[PDB]
């Protein structure tokens, strides 16, 4: 017989990144107008620039 | 604030070596600083252009 329903394109609720991500603000449907998080070089084991 | 998660293996079988001694700056600070203050002030000004 004629095929009425044979699978199809399936929507996914969420995607999951398999790579480690740097901290970030929202850049999707919600866009954050504030400055991106500031990355500071702290907790240095050996002395430098002092 | 919270820390980011490591790999799953590191959370199950992971061990780290850490030292808990913060120390103090008092031994270097506790002195007569009259003579060395001028030399310190010169370095302090050069830190910021």
């Amino acid at each position: 017989g004629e095929i009425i329903y044979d699978g199809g394109l399936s929507s996914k609720l969420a995607d999951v990144v398999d790579k480690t991500t740097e901290p970030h603000n929202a850049d999707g449907a919600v866009k954050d107008g504030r400055i991106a998080p500031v990355k500071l070089d702290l907790e240095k084991q050996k002395l430098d620039k002092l | 604030y919270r820390p980011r998660r490591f790999k799953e293996i590191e959370h199950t079988h992971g061990y780290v070596y850490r030292e808990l001694n913060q120390g103090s700056l008092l031994p270097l600070v506790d002195a007569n600083l009259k003579e060395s203050s001028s030399y310190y002030f010169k370095k302090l000004m050069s830190s910021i252009s």
């Binding site: 400055i35 500031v38 500071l40 070089d41 702290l42 907790e43 240095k44 084991q45 050996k46 002395l47 430098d48 620039k49 002092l50 | 001694n21 913060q22 120390g23 103090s24 700056l25 031994p27 270097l28 830190s47 910021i48």
Partner: protein
């Protein structure tokens, strides 16, 4: 009479001064070295005579 204009707009990211914050954090490293060096010398040499 000739008072130079000092501008530090590029130094500040919002309200955070990255250079000053990183410079101050190095004193914590120096504190650890001072205490560890003093203890190590005390145990190795003990009381001193002249």
């Amino acid at each position: 009479f000739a008072l130079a204009q000092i501008n530090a707009d590029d130094e500040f990211i919002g309200a955070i001064d990255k250079e000053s914050a990183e410079y101050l954090d190095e004193y914590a490293t120096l504190a650890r070295d001072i205490s560890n060096s003093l203890t190590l010398v005390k145990a190795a040499f003990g009381p001193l005579e002249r």
